[PDB]
Amino acid sequence: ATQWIGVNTQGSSLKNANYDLRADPIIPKADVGPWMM
Amino acid sequence: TEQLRVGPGLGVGPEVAATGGFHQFYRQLPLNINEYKLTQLPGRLVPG
Amino acid sequence: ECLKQILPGVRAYALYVRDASLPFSGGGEEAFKRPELATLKGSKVLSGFLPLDR
Amino acid sequence: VYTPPGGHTGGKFTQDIYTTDLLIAAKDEKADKIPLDKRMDGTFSEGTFVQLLSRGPQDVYLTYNPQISLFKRKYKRYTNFAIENFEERFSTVVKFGTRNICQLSKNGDLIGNMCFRVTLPNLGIPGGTWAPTMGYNIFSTIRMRIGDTIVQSHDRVWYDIDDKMFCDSTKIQGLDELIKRNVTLTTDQEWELIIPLKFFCCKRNTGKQQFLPILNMDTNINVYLEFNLLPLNSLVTLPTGSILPDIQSIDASVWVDYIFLDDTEKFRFAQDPCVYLIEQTASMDSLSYATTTSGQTYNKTDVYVDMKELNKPVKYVEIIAYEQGSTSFDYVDIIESATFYLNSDEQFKTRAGEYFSLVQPYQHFKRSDPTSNISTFSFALDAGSFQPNGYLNFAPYVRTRFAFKIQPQTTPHVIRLFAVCLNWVKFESGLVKLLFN
Amino acid sequence: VGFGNKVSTQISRNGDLITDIVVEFVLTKGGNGGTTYYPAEELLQDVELEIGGQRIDKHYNDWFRTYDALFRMNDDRYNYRRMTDWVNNELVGAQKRFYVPLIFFFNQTPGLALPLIALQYHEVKLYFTLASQVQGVNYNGSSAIAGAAQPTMSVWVDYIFLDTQERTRFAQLPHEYLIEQLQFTGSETATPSATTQASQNIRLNFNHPTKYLAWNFNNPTNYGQYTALANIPGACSGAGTAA
Amino acid sequence: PGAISQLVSYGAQDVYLTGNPQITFFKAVYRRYTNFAMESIQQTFDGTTDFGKFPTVTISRNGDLAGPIWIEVNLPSLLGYNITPTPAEGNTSNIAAISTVFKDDYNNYWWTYNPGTTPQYSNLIAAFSNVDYKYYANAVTSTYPPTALSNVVYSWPYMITGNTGTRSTVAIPTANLRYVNGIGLALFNSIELELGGQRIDKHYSEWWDIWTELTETAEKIQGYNTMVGRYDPAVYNAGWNISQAQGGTYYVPLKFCYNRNPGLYMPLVALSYHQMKLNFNINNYLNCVKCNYPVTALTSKNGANPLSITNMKLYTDFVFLDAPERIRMSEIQHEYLVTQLQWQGSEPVTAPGDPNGSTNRKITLNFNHPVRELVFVYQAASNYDVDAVTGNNIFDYEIPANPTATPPYAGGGEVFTEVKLIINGSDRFSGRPGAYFRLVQPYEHHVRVPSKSVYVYSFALEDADSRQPNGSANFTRYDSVQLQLTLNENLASGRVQIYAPNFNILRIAAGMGGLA
Amino acid sequence: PGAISQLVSYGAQDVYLTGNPQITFFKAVYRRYTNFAMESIQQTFDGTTDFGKFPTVTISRNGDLAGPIWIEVNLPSLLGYNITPTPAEGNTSNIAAISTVFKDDYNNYWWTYNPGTTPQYSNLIAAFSNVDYKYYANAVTSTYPPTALSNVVYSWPYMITGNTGTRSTVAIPTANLRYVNGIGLALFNSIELELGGQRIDKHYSEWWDIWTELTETAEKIQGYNTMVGRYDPAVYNAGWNISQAQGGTYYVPLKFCYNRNPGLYMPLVALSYHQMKLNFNINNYLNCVKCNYPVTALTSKNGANPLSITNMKLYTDFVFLDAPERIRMSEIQHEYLVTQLQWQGSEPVTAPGDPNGSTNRKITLNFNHPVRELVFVYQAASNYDVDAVTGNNIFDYEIPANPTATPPYAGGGEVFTEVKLIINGSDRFSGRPGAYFRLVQPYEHHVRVPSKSVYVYSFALEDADSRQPNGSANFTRYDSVQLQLTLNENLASGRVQIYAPNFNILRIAAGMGGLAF
């Protein structure tokens, strides 16, 4: 699994580093693209 | 071979030799570009 | 993603042990094949003479 | 009022027993037969509407039963790779006048393009100048040795011909700066030369890819580059009374671009056999003069080059002439006409030298003679394409030559013909061998 | 960092919500009292803000000046002046740390705090353009000030740390923030020279519900000069005397 | 004999080249396309279109796919504009159209000819050559028709001063007022492309010139140059006029992946809710002119016009597709392969005596998608400044003259001597000299090698965009990237620009568009 | 570290580039082809091959396909020919091969040198530089050899008048006589290509010039100008003579689709009943030359030869196929997608100062087959005339230097100010300035920008035939088409030559070929 070390949520530069010293709960994601709802 | 000396006409198939004389009839209008920006605002009354 | 690594990995390993075990590929004349000339400068040797049959 | 020609309904072509294929399928399978003349969108010049809907029977070959669009383009996904640049070192001190051998370190999974780098030490002679094109003038011979066998060999003249014949125009000015061609280099300054090596590698040669599968060369089977450099006495011109300071060591290295592959191909190239189509060269010259037993020398009115040592399928040949004594660049046209024989049979009607110089090259690149006097003859529709477009196989022939008709000369010129031929190199079971010799 | 250059920041995600942003400059002035006029925000030529590469707004130094002129009052505008200029008749050589608060949609009140917790795909990035022509620091009018030093710049962001309940809600629930934008392009005046009242009709190009329109007539040479110069005290250099 | 003999002979190698044939070279093959037609249709502007403005243009859905876009710019001729400081020589004056005290006979201009006078016709103002068609100052006259001609009037609206001696005095300006060679590119500092409000790409004045010098084809550069300028420095810095100091129509292409690749023409037929816009950043009129005098007013003689642009009209080349293509485009979701441009700036000093720096510099590279290449250019003189005198020649990627050192050094090339790219703290490759990046990399990868020193490095096997991926480096997985520059010792105090064209995917669905 | 960090962390976005790979860039491949060989075979002409003649060539069925064809033309050097009215100074007189009064010692020409004379050698005629290899007139003498060399003699056959005094008169003729720059193209007014008497295509000298400028690449056009004698006006109009006024062998290509596209090579093996024939139209004797005097005829100094063409040969490159393909070529019918030219001539007054014109001019077009592009060529000047004085320079589609107006106007360019095409009475596109069609259109679509006033307009998307169509306008169904040209006001009257390359289908079967409409 060498290609998977340092991976972000999608191809963006998030400064991955966990700046928030805490839990970071999960954001629900409905796969609705052009117009969210 | 057979030479197909095809002529004037518009919107027709390859089997058609010609349909037009000097001015082919059919044409279509555009859809009026950027129309969505234009709203035709209705009027209102002033109480008066 | 796992099978994409495992499948060529297995193929790669099987070929590895094939070569890691014996010298070269085990191929003989197939591997140790010198180039062919295949020109006709001397395909017909002009035997110097033809003796008579006796 | 009379019935218009063809009828009140526009006249039509009949469907007979001679009409076939597209002239019928185009009408029955016409994809746009269904819309009620509403095919086009709005906002247009009327003439564009007319063009878009004015197809005839002659168009059944172009716009009926479409196969592709010009705009629904697809790209192919490719195996992940990355390129790292490594600098290879010579095993010993690099010197002029000897063969400097560089061993490759097998750093990556494939070898791509290669470039040789050298500086010219500042000899310190204010009146001294170097050779016209040090980028090539120093390289007597360059060979790539792959195990025990040689894949290709090139020398000073071929390299310059290649550039003057297959270097596309937008690159020449930059290349001239790169190899310090058409410039004067003085001996007061230390100059940095960077010289591309036109191997069977990917680019620089109108080629495509042809990567070296370095991983599958086993153990003590490695890649060596043989750089045969001329001695300085032939390279640097000094004024009378100036003594050559000499060079005891040269700062030189080889730049090799190594490609690392995704694991899938990484092992395949290391393990599985691969065969590559390669281009090999040969050099056959003929003197413009002949000598006899008493040692007398006479000029030849008619001089021919015997291509008897060449036994390979040839794509094209390249012809130059130059002064016997001035073994340097800048070629001369001394040929009035030339013709080609196979086993004493004419191959084509004798053509003037201007044909070979100005016309024949149309097939390929650099059909011009601004300063060049390089002429060619092809056996293929194009020379540059990787694809083996065509060739003449010399293997079964016993008496091949180009006969060049010249005016009597006062300068002992030599006419030198190069051939570029196809071969194959196989990388299998740790060994590298050619298919044909 | 430097005069005329462009730098950017990416707001780190150490919290749940962010609200104010304060840009700091440390400047040294090249002239005596009265030479400068809002150098901290002349310098901050503009700030663009985007989320995930999506432009949200952009503010310009002239907007900062126009906004201040319109919307900040008697106590807060003097304090603003204290943060952006020298107000105590300071002399050449004075060095001061300046604070230029930004005026984006989320930083004038907590009610519109920007939810970084809910942006695991997008970064919030700010582009800062620094002016090359800063009155009293690099130039006096059009004349360069020899020896002028580069600024020291830093950008501070105020982060909000929420409890476990609200942190979960902001991360899990969708949000619709009702935000403000600025719309701006440059244009020319038609000021008459003599014996006439010229006029112009300039086409507006705006496209969202608009709270207000505002404008000024600027001398491009002198930042914030929206009126004519005159030999009236405070209305031109040397006003009231022979100079 | 001839070819017939060649066909009869047989070699073993033939079994690998002509045995069991797969293709032939003498049987023409082709594919079929849905009928389409092209039309170049004018777009409108929202906002003012002149120097220093930021107009926006919305590209309307005139066709199904929006292809190439050209901007038509009609600039005035500056040979008639004054420079108020008037350092010398009285600016400019029209000779032929005004000042009717001057008489024109045989195209020769004379002062107040009196028809009743003696054979001494008059004082000569300018002579005209009926074979060269040029005007000459201070021609030799021993007779009415001038004889020997010299001092060519390279600038026709010259100055005349009167009431000095017995006759007025005429002289040719010595200050050549002209447009920056690359005027069609210099005018626009940048153009942004957005769809639905999301920025897709952005070009800069410098990039167009860099891309032209880097990826242009032979025998079109003279055409391209004519359309936007770019007079080669060898003649531009020779002081030419008339051809370099005139207005007229310039044609600026927008070289986006969506403009020069049919497969990426913007599918507006499938974008009913999102329009795309071009956001312009245009220069101030007190720019793009490399004048001999400081330039301050640069304003017309005839009234007071501040060198306004006369016209600006852009055209989008639309394709109109037939019914089956338009139906599939609106119903089927698409993912298009697109290129974005990003760049980074830095400002070295290259040790000017004083302890302000050294020749060892690093630039942090904050790029965000797979990158094709890194392109490095160096702008240092007054050619990054706003001054006209030795300034504003932004397309000047070389070392300036600076004879203010014991050696009166000037120019020389080799802006950078060695560079190495550092990825996450480690070298990606071993260091190579500037010559490698200036000449070898474009010799291998690109269609041309640049004249102006431009340093490139590619992550591709070969590349000029080429309408297909061929290798990239994904900078989203590089947490810290720095490019280390080893600089020369005779550089000025200016800026370095680094450009990085990169990949993304444009998703089209349900009338809306946007990037991943 | 290294490229491994790049290789390994290819990242999420790159999945679209490297996921589920479809091709490899690292495996060189080629396809096996059909054995063939090429032979260059000379064809002969039927009819006199000289000025004003119309010879034909029948291409003999030597091979299976007829490939590229080149015309090899042998022209005399014309400086050996006199201008019959003798405008001035005896245009030419050979001074080396004839007239034994000329003496030659150290390559220096002297008048009647007497070996028994004094140190004053004789009267110098021409000095020779042993380093430059040039002759010089009026050199300074004193020692036996001349000491200072100037007044370079470019045309060797100068004009001499003898026995009038103590020295003969030596003058360099003030008459720079030369072939027009474009002799390679100008010699041939037109050429027809037909199968079985039925014409397929016809090319003109104007098209070959335009097409080469429009569709040729660097380092081929430079050779094109050398073998197809042409010169850039930048040097031709500088007064060059001996460097250009030469005869010898010229090589003119015939750039037909049947000659340029290997796949469209004429399959003569499949055409047993129709022979391919070329019909030539060679220019006239008093044409294709330029001079600074009114030339009415050019004749040899030796004899009365009226500057005839020395020879002319046609070389065709034939393709010979192996048996498998040769059999298929005969037995299987073929349908080729080919191109042909169409044109119409028109000679409007063209907005002259003269009151017989207007700047709003329309030209009605008469094209039918699906057109790939329109090309407009402008010929309105004294260079449209057959005169030798400024005339015959037909390949110069610019505004002439005609100072016959209040301003002494010359050159300038921008022949047309706006161009619009109208189909069926309605615009095909909004009108654009002329520069759009001189610079933008050819830059975007074509291989080369002529950078000479050439106007083009494409109906195809980014091609130059490109061996595959990329769009066309079908004129066969158009009711009427007009080209609207907004003219400049500094134009002379003359021709507007409009070409419209188009597509058609060539059907070959049962040994017969023909064009299908």
TrEMBL record, chain D:
<protein>
    <submittedName>
        <fullName>Major capsid protein VP54</fullName>
    </submittedName>
</protein>
From TrEMBL, chain G:
<feature type="domain" description="Major capsid protein N-terminal">
    <location>
        <begin position="171"/>
        <end position="322"/>
    </location>
</feature>
<dbReference type="InterPro" id="IPR038519">
    <property type="entry name" value="MCP_C_sf"/>
</dbReference>
<dbReference type="InterPro" id="IPR031654">
    <property type="entry name" value="Capsid_N"/>
</dbReference>
<feature type="domain" description="Major capsid protein N-terminal">
    <location>
        <begin position="24"/>
        <end position="78"/>
    </location>
</feature>
<dbReference type="Pfam" id="PF04451">
    <property type="entry name" value="Capsid_NCLDV"/>
</dbReference>
<dbReference type="GO" id="GO:0019028">
    <property type="term" value="C:viral capsid"/>
</dbReference>
<protein>
    <submittedName>
        <fullName>Capsid protein</fullName>
    </submittedName>
</protein>
<keyword id="KW-0167">Capsid protein</keyword>
<dbReference type="InterPro" id="IPR007542">
    <property type="entry name" value="MCP_C"/>
</dbReference>
<feature type="domain" description="Major capsid protein C-terminal">
    <location>
        <begin position="325"/>
        <end position="514"/>
    </location>
</feature>
<keyword id="KW-0946">Virion</keyword>
<dbReference type="Pfam" id="PF16903">
    <property type="entry name" value="Capsid_N"/>
</dbReference>
<dbReference type="GO" id="GO:0005198">
    <property type="term" value="F:structural molecule activity"/>
</dbReference>
<dbReference type="InterPro" id="IPR016112">
    <property type="entry name" value="VP_dsDNA_II"/>
</dbReference>
